[PDB]
Amino acid sequence: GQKVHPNGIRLGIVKPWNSTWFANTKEFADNLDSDFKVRQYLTKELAKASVSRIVIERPAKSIRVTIHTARPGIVIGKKGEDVEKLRKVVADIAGVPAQINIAEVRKPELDAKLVADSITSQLERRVMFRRAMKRAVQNAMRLGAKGIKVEVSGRLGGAEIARTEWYREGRVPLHTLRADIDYNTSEAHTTYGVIGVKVWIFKGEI
Amino acid sequence: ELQEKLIAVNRVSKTVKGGRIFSFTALTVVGDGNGRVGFGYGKAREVPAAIQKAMEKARRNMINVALNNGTLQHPVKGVHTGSRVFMQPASEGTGIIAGGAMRAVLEVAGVHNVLAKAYGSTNPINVVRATIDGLENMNSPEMVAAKRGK
Amino acid sequence: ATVNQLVRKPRARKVAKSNVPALEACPQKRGVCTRVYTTTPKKPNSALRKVCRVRLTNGFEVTSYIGGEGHNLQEHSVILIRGGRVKDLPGVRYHTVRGALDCSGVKDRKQARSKYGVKRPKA
Amino acid sequence: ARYLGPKLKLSRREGTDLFLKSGVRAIDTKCKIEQAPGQHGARKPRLSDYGVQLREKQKVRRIYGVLERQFRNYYKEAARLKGNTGENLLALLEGRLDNVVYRMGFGATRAEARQLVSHKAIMVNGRVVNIASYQVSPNDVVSIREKAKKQSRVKAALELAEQREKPTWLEVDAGKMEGTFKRKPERSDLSADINEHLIVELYSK
RNA sequence: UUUUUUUUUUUUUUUUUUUU
RNA sequence: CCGCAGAAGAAGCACCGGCUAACUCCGUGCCAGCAGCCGCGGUAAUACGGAGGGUGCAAGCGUUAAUCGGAAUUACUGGGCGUAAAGCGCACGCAGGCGGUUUGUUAAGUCAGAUGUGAAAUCCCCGGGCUCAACCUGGGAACUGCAUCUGAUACUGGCAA
RNA sequence: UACGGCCGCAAGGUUAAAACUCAAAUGAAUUGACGGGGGCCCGCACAAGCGGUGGAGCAUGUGGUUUAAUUCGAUGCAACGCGAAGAACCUUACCUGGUCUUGACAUCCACGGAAGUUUUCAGAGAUGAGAAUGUGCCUUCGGGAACCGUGAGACAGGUGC
């Protein structure tokens, strides 16, 4: 009957920021219009390997974008012509330059996000995703974590059918503000309407 | 390469003070391909968790049924309140035509030849709780020899 | 949980309830339409559905419905009888099959195919 | 009587490798298993207990091409037979006149084969017996007739089945096109991938 | 095993599809 | 049967919940209608009533007047009596059912068979003959009892003690 | 339960028959209705008390008056001073008229332009008819900005629960 975030409530406690910047009394408003715009271009340019963390720092309002993506080599491309585009389009909206910093998503198996970017791929085949769903969860937990719960909502059958499915491969203490837990979500579609997935990953006790 | 199946559940959810209260149960069986079969029950907050607590309980050692070789030699008493019950063997070549209301109690070890459907009650909890206690009360081909000599 | 209160109206929506009184032989028949009735004020606003009575040795009087489409269902005719009491109708206990003799019913309604017996349109 | 098709439709709801269409190309290219067969509900179907046997019924009804009439008039006498299901019922479908002719190599499909038989091309020791429920007993012979013997359809069966398994229970001469059943069928090499016993227990629900 | 501080307060329509 | 001549010349019904089975786009306001167990319609009616697609099966499809099905039930052959229904406050004797239990004994019923009946389409099984499924049949068989007798002694009934 | 009588002193006892009909339940075991049970209590519940509200006079929304004609939804524990903490420009319900249906706001190409200060006269307002003064920054004189147009083809919305 609740959905209760472990993250967010805890920015300085094992669970680090999606973004952080210091804009002043009469210089926030444009920074906020740019924090969705810069993330929309990137999270469509980086889709080919996802982005666990789409990190917006702005060291002098110029934007130090740190992209933890599971394939940096495909966004370095054939060696740095994409980087050039990647440092221009997000700087075109913001009116200032853009300190593009790359990284790997170190093992998507154990990750704070990339488990939901298994699952929400599986729907692009349109056939029996049930063969692979709870197997993907299984596989992920075989290289890391100690419990996980999963909730999936949406049009996932035929004609008019709309339900919610819930699974538990291991124990999850829902909120413990000391622990290495995460919450995440992701999305998918199937030509009848939405398919929206949610996770809770109790990876460790502290 | 062990075998795992369910057979029954309760809708168990009721009015109270007060709105509605809900709960979640199972009844399950397990087997080993060398003529071994077993059972038990569970409960949880979640349905596929009431299956796991059951099937971890069904894994207790699994009774070796007297099977020589594709059928069985005696109909053991599955004594219950009015179930009765008695299986009917068949001559080694024709299949497991038994009560699909409980059939997984004999199916999980592979047993090809036995029949009888659920003779006095159409509730699985009744012809289940009866069958497993006849199967533990059985005798080997080697025992019935001693029973009629030495 | 209290049976002489429960039994009436619990949970089902087809239900058994029907009341189908007398027998004497069989319930199907040929039906001399004996006298035609057109009347009796009710909340179901029952126009044109001209019920008739039936001279049958049964112990009490009996009555039967127009079955379906066909205005000239005339009181000298001897069409066929079967059971099925539609909730619309007090007093009645059977409905006709009114297609034989001179009665017609089904004038040109192409959808009847085997349902009442009709030939194909311009196909 | 045998409904006739669309033929490849049957494979997109019954399954893969069907002898219905055994020959050229349309295998894995067009039979639409794993791609998307029942496309509308393919996100999630749900099966049934009668479900899985009723499509294994379907398999046996549509692969060999037979009525529900035959499925009851083979059952009539099967009720006297002494053996198991996959000898009292299944074994007969590989050995009725319209279905043995493909097993020997006189037509390249099972829908072909029945139609060569019904068109007076085939005999059993001198009998034109196109009453195709007629089942060819072991050792008595079965041939294509003289002017149909080396007709285009037989060759394109023979030079395609050449690389394939020639099963042990019957034989043929490929160059004068005649044969028989050499022994009785067995539930251990008959090569239908089906669970045999399950078409007869389906009448128990 | 003394247990009357008044007797009564119309109907409905609540119910988030289903195979497990 | 054998040459020519054309895929020519041959097919549709239930329908479509869920029952063995495939569904939506809408309509009409428990209108009008299915009414079998169900289930449906109370302004978003999956099958009512129009239609569009395809399905079950193919001279066949729905369905009907009923009775048993599944379901176990008037039970010598097959039974529940705390339950539905269910040892009926109560038993003077008159007919009735059960009359102790073993030896010497008998064979009427019990059983085993000899021989007869049930000539011919069985039901149950094999072998054919028409091109053959049918169909048309040949062969083998099994028919509690009844007769008329050779046995065999544990029950049913007795005789003696 | 009676429609023959065996009994009974009548009324009834005892046979448990039947015209016809019509769809499942008794029992366990579990609910717990808001409950002056017994029992454990407890609160301006009630206590002891205190200052009142009330009848006449005012500030004022239902309903209630017919008024030319009237704005929902408000009507006990879960609604009071509506939501309006300004129902005569007023964040427009509604009575009326004036007007429109890309409206008022806002893009993607196409052809073009410097932006504005000031006053006169009409009109209820939206809007209508005149008169003066004005002409910026780069600057490939290319491309245009600050910033106003007219033609397109895509094309805008609201407490509706």
mmCIF file of N, CA, C and O in Angstrom, chain D residues 11-67:
data_model
loop_
_atom_site.group_PDB
_atom_site.id
_atom_site.type_symbol
_atom_site.label_atom_id
_atom_site.label_comp_id
_atom_site.label_asym_id
_atom_site.label_seq_id
_atom_site.Cartn_x
_atom_site.Cartn_y
_atom_site.Cartn_z
ATOM 1 N N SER D 11 0.500 -24.334 -39.499
ATOM 2 C CA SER D 11 1.864 -24.350 -38.897
ATOM 3 C C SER D 11 2.217 -23.215 -37.905
ATOM 4 O O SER D 11 2.894 -23.390 -36.891
ATOM 5 N N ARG D 12 1.603 -22.062 -38.135
ATOM 6 C CA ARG D 12 1.586 -20.835 -37.336
ATOM 7 C C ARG D 12 0.637 -20.867 -36.119
ATOM 8 O O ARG D 12 0.457 -19.916 -35.370
ATOM 9 N N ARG D 13 -0.036 -22.043 -35.865
ATOM 10 C CA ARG D 13 -0.936 -22.266 -34.683
ATOM 11 C C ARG D 13 -0.736 -23.700 -34.115
ATOM 12 O O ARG D 13 -0.670 -23.891 -32.943
ATOM 13 N N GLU D 14 -0.293 -24.674 -34.940
ATOM 14 C CA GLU D 14 0.004 -26.058 -34.538
ATOM 15 C C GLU D 14 1.479 -26.281 -34.265
ATOM 16 O O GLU D 14 1.773 -26.956 -33.262
ATOM 17 N N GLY D 15 2.370 -25.741 -35.067
ATOM 18 C CA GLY D 15 3.788 -25.858 -34.813
ATOM 19 C C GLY D 15 4.713 -26.058 -36.070
ATOM 20 O O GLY D 15 4.468 -25.826 -37.264
ATOM 21 N N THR D 16 5.925 -26.316 -35.609
ATOM 22 C CA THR D 16 7.114 -26.396 -36.513
ATOM 23 C C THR D 16 7.430 -27.793 -37.170
ATOM 24 O O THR D 16 6.878 -28.823 -36.766
ATOM 25 N N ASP D 17 8.305 -27.837 -38.184
ATOM 26 C CA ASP D 17 8.660 -29.011 -38.978
ATOM 27 C C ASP D 17 7.507 -29.862 -39.555
ATOM 28 O O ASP D 17 7.740 -31.046 -39.810
ATOM 29 N N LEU D 18 6.331 -29.349 -39.948
ATOM 30 C CA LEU D 18 5.150 -30.212 -40.242
ATOM 31 C C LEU D 18 5.318 -30.827 -41.629
ATOM 32 O O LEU D 18 5.642 -30.149 -42.547
ATOM 33 N N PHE D 19 4.942 -32.105 -41.681
ATOM 34 C CA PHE D 19 5.073 -32.815 -42.911
ATOM 35 C C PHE D 19 4.127 -32.334 -44.044
ATOM 36 O O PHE D 19 4.304 -32.641 -45.225
ATOM 37 N N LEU D 20 3.068 -31.620 -43.627
ATOM 38 C CA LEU D 20 2.134 -30.805 -44.414
ATOM 39 C C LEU D 20 2.757 -30.007 -45.567
ATOM 40 O O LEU D 20 2.371 -30.114 -46.743
ATOM 41 N N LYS D 21 3.876 -29.311 -45.157
ATOM 42 C CA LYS D 21 4.863 -28.621 -46.024
ATOM 43 C C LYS D 21 6.336 -28.967 -45.664
ATOM 44 O O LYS D 21 6.993 -28.168 -44.945
ATOM 45 N N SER D 22 6.841 -30.140 -46.128
ATOM 46 C CA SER D 22 8.133 -30.695 -45.820
ATOM 47 C C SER D 22 9.302 -30.215 -46.699
ATOM 48 O O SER D 22 10.427 -30.367 -46.281
ATOM 49 N N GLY D 23 9.070 -29.712 -47.903
ATOM 50 C CA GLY D 23 10.039 -29.463 -49.017
ATOM 51 C C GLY D 23 10.926 -28.185 -49.033
ATOM 52 O O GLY D 23 11.987 -28.186 -48.370
ATOM 53 N N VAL D 24 10.508 -27.209 -49.868
ATOM 54 C CA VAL D 24 11.156 -26.006 -50.332
ATOM 55 C C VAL D 24 10.763 -24.765 -49.460
ATOM 56 O O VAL D 24 9.595 -24.437 -49.332
ATOM 57 N N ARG D 25 11.777 -24.204 -48.778
ATOM 58 C CA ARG D 25 12.012 -22.806 -48.344
ATOM 59 C C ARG D 25 11.234 -22.372 -47.166
ATOM 60 O O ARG D 25 11.812 -21.812 -46.267
ATOM 61 N N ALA D 26 9.950 -22.615 -47.232
ATOM 62 C CA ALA D 26 9.063 -21.971 -46.275
ATOM 63 C C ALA D 26 9.298 -22.362 -44.803
ATOM 64 O O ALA D 26 8.772 -21.674 -43.927
ATOM 65 N N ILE D 27 10.005 -23.468 -44.547
ATOM 66 C CA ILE D 27 10.646 -23.780 -43.269
ATOM 67 C C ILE D 27 11.677 -22.717 -42.760
ATOM 68 O O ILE D 27 12.625 -22.379 -43.445
ATOM 69 N N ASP D 28 11.450 -22.266 -41.467
ATOM 70 C CA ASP D 28 12.057 -21.135 -40.725
ATOM 71 C C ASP D 28 12.008 -19.700 -41.353
ATOM 72 O O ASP D 28 11.902 -18.711 -40.717
ATOM 73 N N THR D 29 11.937 -19.614 -42.679
ATOM 74 C CA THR D 29 11.649 -18.380 -43.432
ATOM 75 C C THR D 29 10.279 -17.837 -43.233
ATOM 76 O O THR D 29 10.169 -16.692 -42.932
ATOM 77 N N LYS D 30 9.239 -18.614 -43.198
ATOM 78 C CA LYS D 30 7.814 -18.183 -43.177
ATOM 79 C C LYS D 30 6.796 -18.778 -42.173
ATOM 80 O O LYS D 30 5.594 -18.397 -42.114
ATOM 81 N N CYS D 31 7.142 -19.808 -41.376
ATOM 82 C CA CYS D 31 6.353 -20.522 -40.409
ATOM 83 C C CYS D 31 6.185 -19.852 -38.985
ATOM 84 O O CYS D 31 5.383 -20.235 -38.140
ATOM 85 N N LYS D 32 6.870 -18.680 -38.870
ATOM 86 C CA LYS D 32 6.469 -17.536 -37.953
ATOM 87 C C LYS D 32 6.348 -17.792 -36.454
ATOM 88 O O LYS D 32 6.402 -16.854 -35.660
ATOM 89 N N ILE D 33 6.488 -19.030 -35.957
ATOM 90 C CA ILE D 33 7.008 -19.349 -34.609
ATOM 91 C C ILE D 33 8.304 -18.553 -34.294
ATOM 92 O O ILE D 33 9.130 -18.286 -35.204
ATOM 93 N N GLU D 34 8.533 -18.173 -33.032
ATOM 94 C CA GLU D 34 9.412 -17.187 -32.396
ATOM 95 C C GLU D 34 9.462 -15.718 -32.911
ATOM 96 O O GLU D 34 9.901 -14.834 -32.180
ATOM 97 N N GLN D 35 9.073 -15.476 -34.134
ATOM 98 C CA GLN D 35 8.961 -14.129 -34.828
ATOM 99 C C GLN D 35 7.795 -13.299 -34.255
ATOM 100 O O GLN D 35 7.897 -12.215 -33.699
ATOM 101 N N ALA D 36 6.576 -13.989 -34.291
ATOM 102 C CA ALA D 36 5.251 -13.658 -33.780
ATOM 103 C C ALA D 36 4.189 -14.465 -34.629
ATOM 104 O O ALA D 36 3.770 -13.941 -35.644
ATOM 105 N N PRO D 37 3.775 -15.653 -34.162
ATOM 106 C CA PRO D 37 2.554 -16.286 -34.705
ATOM 107 C C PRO D 37 1.164 -15.717 -34.347
ATOM 108 O O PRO D 37 0.505 -15.003 -35.165
ATOM 109 N N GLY D 38 0.532 -15.786 -33.144
ATOM 110 C CA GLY D 38 -0.731 -15.187 -32.688
ATOM 111 C C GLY D 38 -0.616 -13.695 -32.267
ATOM 112 O O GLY D 38 -0.854 -13.368 -31.075
ATOM 113 N N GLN D 39 -0.136 -12.801 -33.173
ATOM 114 C CA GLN D 39 0.550 -11.548 -32.934
ATOM 115 C C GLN D 39 -0.200 -10.688 -31.845
ATOM 116 O O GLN D 39 0.416 -10.412 -30.758
ATOM 117 N N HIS D 40 -1.514 -10.468 -31.929
ATOM 118 C CA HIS D 40 -2.398 -9.700 -31.063
ATOM 119 C C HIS D 40 -2.162 -9.986 -29.563
ATOM 120 O O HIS D 40 -1.727 -9.045 -28.853
ATOM 121 N N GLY D 41 -2.266 -11.290 -29.072
ATOM 122 C CA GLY D 41 -1.992 -11.690 -27.681
ATOM 123 C C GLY D 41 -0.616 -12.191 -27.341
ATOM 124 O O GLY D 41 -0.462 -12.616 -26.164
ATOM 125 N N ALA D 42 0.352 -12.132 -28.278
ATOM 126 C CA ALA D 42 1.678 -12.700 -28.146
ATOM 127 C C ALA D 42 2.552 -12.158 -26.978
ATOM 128 O O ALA D 42 3.376 -12.853 -26.424
ATOM 129 N N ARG D 43 2.196 -10.913 -26.509
ATOM 130 C CA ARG D 43 2.759 -10.393 -25.304
ATOM 131 C C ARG D 43 2.688 -11.275 -24.026
ATOM 132 O O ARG D 43 3.661 -11.536 -23.322
ATOM 133 N N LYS D 44 1.468 -11.787 -23.909
ATOM 134 C CA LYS D 44 1.233 -12.956 -23.002
ATOM 135 C C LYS D 44 0.023 -13.849 -23.482
ATOM 136 O O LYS D 44 -1.127 -13.598 -23.085
ATOM 137 N N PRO D 45 0.140 -15.005 -24.143
ATOM 138 C CA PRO D 45 -0.883 -16.058 -24.038
ATOM 139 C C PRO D 45 -0.781 -16.674 -22.618
ATOM 140 O O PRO D 45 0.155 -16.354 -21.839
ATOM 141 N N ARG D 46 -1.767 -17.535 -22.281
ATOM 142 C CA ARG D 46 -1.851 -18.413 -21.122
ATOM 143 C C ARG D 46 -2.339 -19.676 -21.728
ATOM 144 O O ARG D 46 -3.264 -19.705 -22.487
ATOM 145 N N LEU D 47 -1.756 -20.834 -21.424
ATOM 146 C CA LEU D 47 -2.222 -22.211 -21.779
ATOM 147 C C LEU D 47 -3.281 -22.835 -20.876
ATOM 148 O O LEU D 47 -3.711 -22.270 -19.876
ATOM 149 N N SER D 48 -3.789 -24.031 -21.222
ATOM 150 C CA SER D 48 -4.691 -24.881 -20.407
ATOM 151 C C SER D 48 -4.318 -26.376 -20.428
ATOM 152 O O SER D 48 -3.714 -26.952 -21.331
ATOM 153 N N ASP D 49 -4.864 -27.020 -19.378
ATOM 154 C CA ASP D 49 -4.617 -28.416 -19.170
ATOM 155 C C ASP D 49 -5.235 -29.284 -20.257
ATOM 156 O O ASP D 49 -4.565 -30.161 -20.837
ATOM 157 N N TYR D 50 -6.474 -28.974 -20.607
ATOM 158 C CA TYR D 50 -7.054 -29.573 -21.830
ATOM 159 C C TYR D 50 -6.448 -28.944 -23.058
ATOM 160 O O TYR D 50 -6.306 -29.584 -24.094
ATOM 161 N N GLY D 51 -6.227 -27.637 -23.056
ATOM 162 C CA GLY D 51 -5.519 -26.782 -23.970
ATOM 163 C C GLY D 51 -4.395 -27.556 -24.698
ATOM 164 O O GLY D 51 -4.363 -27.613 -25.943
ATOM 165 N N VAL D 52 -3.409 -28.042 -24.014
ATOM 166 C CA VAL D 52 -2.091 -28.585 -24.541
ATOM 167 C C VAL D 52 -2.291 -29.946 -25.284
ATOM 168 O O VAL D 52 -1.741 -30.101 -26.294
ATOM 169 N N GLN D 53 -3.166 -30.801 -24.728
ATOM 170 C CA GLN D 53 -3.627 -31.927 -25.461
ATOM 171 C C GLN D 53 -4.570 -31.512 -26.631
ATOM 172 O O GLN D 53 -4.469 -32.195 -27.658
ATOM 173 N N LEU D 54 -5.507 -30.539 -26.525
ATOM 174 C CA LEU D 54 -6.397 -30.235 -27.678
ATOM 175 C C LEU D 54 -5.626 -29.755 -28.904
ATOM 176 O O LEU D 54 -5.872 -30.250 -30.027
ATOM 177 N N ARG D 55 -4.543 -28.992 -28.797
ATOM 178 C CA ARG D 55 -3.650 -28.714 -29.922
ATOM 179 C C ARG D 55 -2.723 -29.857 -30.340
ATOM 180 O O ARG D 55 -2.090 -29.769 -31.412
ATOM 181 N N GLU D 56 -2.374 -30.799 -29.480
ATOM 182 C CA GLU D 56 -1.756 -32.094 -29.870
ATOM 183 C C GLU D 56 -2.770 -33.083 -30.608
ATOM 184 O O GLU D 56 -2.381 -33.592 -31.685
ATOM 185 N N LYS D 57 -4.060 -33.106 -30.210
ATOM 186 C CA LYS D 57 -5.162 -33.563 -31.103
ATOM 187 C C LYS D 57 -5.106 -32.955 -32.515
ATOM 188 O O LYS D 57 -4.977 -33.569 -33.558
ATOM 189 N N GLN D 58 -5.216 -31.645 -32.477
ATOM 190 C CA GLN D 58 -5.084 -30.739 -33.691
ATOM 191 C C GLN D 58 -3.891 -31.099 -34.588
ATOM 192 O O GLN D 58 -4.107 -31.252 -35.771
ATOM 193 N N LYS D 59 -2.673 -31.334 -34.016
ATOM 194 C CA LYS D 59 -1.441 -31.725 -34.646
ATOM 195 C C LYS D 59 -1.666 -32.911 -35.477
ATOM 196 O O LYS D 59 -1.547 -32.817 -36.685
ATOM 197 N N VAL D 60 -2.117 -34.022 -34.872
ATOM 198 C CA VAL D 60 -2.437 -35.294 -35.471
ATOM 199 C C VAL D 60 -3.595 -35.222 -36.498
ATOM 200 O O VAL D 60 -3.590 -35.823 -37.566
ATOM 201 N N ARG D 61 -4.657 -34.403 -36.215
ATOM 202 C CA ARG D 61 -5.753 -34.168 -37.177
ATOM 203 C C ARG D 61 -5.296 -33.472 -38.453
ATOM 204 O O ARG D 61 -5.587 -33.983 -39.527
ATOM 205 N N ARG D 62 -4.457 -32.448 -38.367
ATOM 206 C CA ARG D 62 -4.037 -31.535 -39.496
ATOM 207 C C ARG D 62 -2.667 -31.977 -40.268
ATOM 208 O O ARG D 62 -2.639 -31.687 -41.473
ATOM 209 N N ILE D 63 -1.737 -32.669 -39.577
ATOM 210 C CA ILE D 63 -0.406 -33.069 -40.224
ATOM 211 C C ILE D 63 -0.626 -34.151 -41.323
ATOM 212 O O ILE D 63 0.050 -34.085 -42.315
ATOM 213 N N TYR D 64 -1.508 -35.085 -40.993
ATOM 214 C CA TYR D 64 -1.848 -36.206 -41.876
ATOM 215 C C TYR D 64 -3.051 -35.948 -42.808
ATOM 216 O O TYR D 64 -3.098 -36.562 -43.865
ATOM 217 N N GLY D 65 -3.849 -34.980 -42.373
ATOM 218 C CA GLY D 65 -5.100 -34.527 -43.020
ATOM 219 C C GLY D 65 -6.289 -35.478 -42.924
ATOM 220 O O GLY D 65 -6.501 -36.151 -43.951
ATOM 221 N N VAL D 66 -7.002 -35.495 -41.840
ATOM 222 C CA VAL D 66 -8.218 -36.409 -41.582
ATOM 223 C C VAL D 66 -9.334 -35.697 -40.817
ATOM 224 O O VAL D 66 -9.151 -34.733 -40.053
ATOM 225 N N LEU D 67 -10.600 -36.076 -41.125
ATOM 226 C CA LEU D 67 -11.817 -35.698 -40.432
ATOM 227 C C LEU D 67 -11.831 -36.061 -38.944
ATOM 228 O O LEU D 67 -11.068 -36.937 -38.535
#
